Amino acid sequence: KDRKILNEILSNTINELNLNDKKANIKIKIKPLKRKIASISLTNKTIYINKNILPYLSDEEIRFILAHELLHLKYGKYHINEFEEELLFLFPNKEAILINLINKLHQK
Amino acid sequence: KDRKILNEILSNTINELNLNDKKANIKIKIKPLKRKIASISLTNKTIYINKNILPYLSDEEIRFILAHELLHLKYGKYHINEFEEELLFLFPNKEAILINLINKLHQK
Amino acid sequence: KDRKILNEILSNTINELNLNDKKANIKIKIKPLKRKIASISLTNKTIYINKNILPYLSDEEIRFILAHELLHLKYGKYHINEFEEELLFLFPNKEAILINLINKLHQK
Amino acid sequence: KDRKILNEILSNTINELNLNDKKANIKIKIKPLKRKIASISLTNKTIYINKNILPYLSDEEIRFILAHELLHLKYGKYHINEFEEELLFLFPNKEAILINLINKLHQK
Ligand code: NA
Ligand code: NA
Ligand code: NA
Ligand code: NA
Ligand SMILES: [Zn+2]
Ligand SMILES: [Zn+2]
Numbered sequence: 323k324d325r326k327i328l329n330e331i332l333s334n335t336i337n338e339l340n341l342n343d344k345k346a347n348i349k350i351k352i353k354p355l356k357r358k359i360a361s362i363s364l365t366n367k368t369i370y371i372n373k374n375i376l377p378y379l380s381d382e383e384i385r386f387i388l389a390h391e392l393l394h395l396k397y398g399k400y401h402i403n404e405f406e407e408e409l410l411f412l413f414p415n416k417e418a419i420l421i422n423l424i425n426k427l428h429q430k
Numbered sequence: 431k432d433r434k435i436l437n438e439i440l441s442n443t444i445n446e447l448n449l450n451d452k453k454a455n456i457k458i459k460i461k462p463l464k465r466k467i468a469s470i471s472l473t474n475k476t477i478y479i480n481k482n483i484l485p486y487l488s489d490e491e492i493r494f495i496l497a498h499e500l501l502h503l504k505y506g507k508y509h510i511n512e513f514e515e516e517l518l519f520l521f522p523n524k525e526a527i528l529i530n531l532i533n534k535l536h537q538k
Numbered sequence: 539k540d541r542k543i544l545n546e547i548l549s550n551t552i553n554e555l556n557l558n559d560k561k562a563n564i565k566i567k568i569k570p571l572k573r574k575i576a577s578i579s580l581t582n583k584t585i586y587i588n589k590n591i592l593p594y595l596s597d598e599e600i601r602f603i604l605a606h607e608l609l610h611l612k613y614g615k616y617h618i619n620e621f622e623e624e625l626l627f628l629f630p631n632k633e634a635i636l637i638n639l640i641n642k643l644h645q646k
Numbered sequence: 647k648d649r650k651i652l653n654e655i656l657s658n659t660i661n662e663l664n665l666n667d668k669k670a671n672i673k674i675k676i677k678p679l680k681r682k683i684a685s686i687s688l689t690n691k692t693i694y695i696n697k698n699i700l701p702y703l704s705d706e707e708i709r710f711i712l713a714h715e716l717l718h719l720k721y722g723k724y725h726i727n728e729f730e731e732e733l734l735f736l737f738p739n740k741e742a743i744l745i746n747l748i749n750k751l752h753q754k
């Protein structure tokens with residue numbers, strides 16, 4: 323079957339969120355995943371949808387899954403591993419936001 | 431202090447996601463919250479930001495928090511409680527999406 | 539088929555965690571669930587496992603699912619709804635723990 | 647101050663869950679953490695509690711945090727990275743359990 327409908331979801335969701343030139347050039351690819359629905363690969367600059375889940379997802383479900391992944395991509399940052407001497411990309415979460423807040427209160 | 435900057439985040443994030451007329455008319459209000467950063471009240475048609483957290487959040491943090499809440503609002507649905515004889519609004523999550531999939535496989 | 543093996547998991551997991559007399563008297567019941575694997579009903583004092591998921595779960599999976607639910611039951615508390623004039627049971631989470639911390643810093 | 651009360655929580659929580667000889671020999675250490683409350687290090691065989699959070703946590707909070715981490719440790723497994731030619735430890739979650747279920751339905 324065709325994945326023409328999938329590249330259209332990706333593109334109009336990329337535009338909606340207003341992704342910067344670097345994060346905006348991301349392709350979509352159907353591949354079997356061991357333990358997730360979707361997965362972002364920053365080295366490949368692609369998002370993978372689980373080959374086995376996609377045939378059962380509704381249009382609304384796919385649109386939500388993708389917009390949710392890409393939102394976390396949009397507000398993610400790069401950090402230095404130091405020990406591994408490697409660049410590491412970290413996605414945001416409420417625990418990270420709240421721990422940092424309290425941490426900053428304790429520097430005072 | 432002024433919350434003029436907060437209503438501007440809300441409005442341009444509402445437009446970005448393309449919220450329908452009903453979900454789009456949502457106001458923002460600073461109020462103390464017992465156990466959350468933000469909280470949507472569908473009867474009041476307002477989103478509350480924790481009075482105590484907001485002074486420490488960055489512009490990027492607020493933009494992400496709000497866009498995350500509103501995304502879950504956008505793809506949420508109403509369901510009948512039956513027992514309580516009341517309307518109930520349910521937000522999406524990966525467990526709900528995957529349980530329904532398997533459930534649908536078992537009707538066959 | 540028999541659910542004799544299921545009541546044995548429940549009982550030895552209840553004992554392991556050391557649940558108090560009130561929370562300890564909880565029965566287990568196989569029932570179809572709309573959007574979850576397991577679900578605790580405090581009025582019925584029972585835990586429901588999704589009829590459609592259970593045939594595919596391993597022994598280790600069931601043991602983990604149950605121990606995870608019962609742990610959140612063990613450290614949960616009752617709170618007054620005030621508006622609804624009803625008792626409400628709230629399960630713990632990292633957001634609830636961290637929001638309360640910061641809230642307590644702002645009373646000073 | 648003393649961390650004698652912390653090693654007592656760890657030990658009786660290790661015994662309660664019935665951790666196997668390998669996972670059971672785990673020490674506890676107070677250290678500042680960038681974005682988490684607690685963190686398990688399998689190479690160091692230690693659990694770290696955030697230096698800045700711990701002074702504000704209640705006895706019940708600490709007991710729950712630790713029992714929650716150690717439960718996910720207990721039902722975690724090792725997997726081969728293949729590409730990195732390294733051993734990787736993976737903690738359980740409902741998405742991993744449900745994705746695997748559907749994946750197994752598609753091998754048929
Ligand atoms: Na655009
Ligand atoms: Na618009
Ligand atoms: Na006992
Ligand atoms: Na023991
Ligand atoms: Zn999220
Ligand atoms: Zn979410």
Ligand SMILES: [Zn+2]
Nearest residue numbers: 606610631714
């Ligand atoms: Zn949990």
Ligand SMILES: [Zn+2]
Nearest residue numbers: 606714718739
């Ligand atoms: Zn968990």
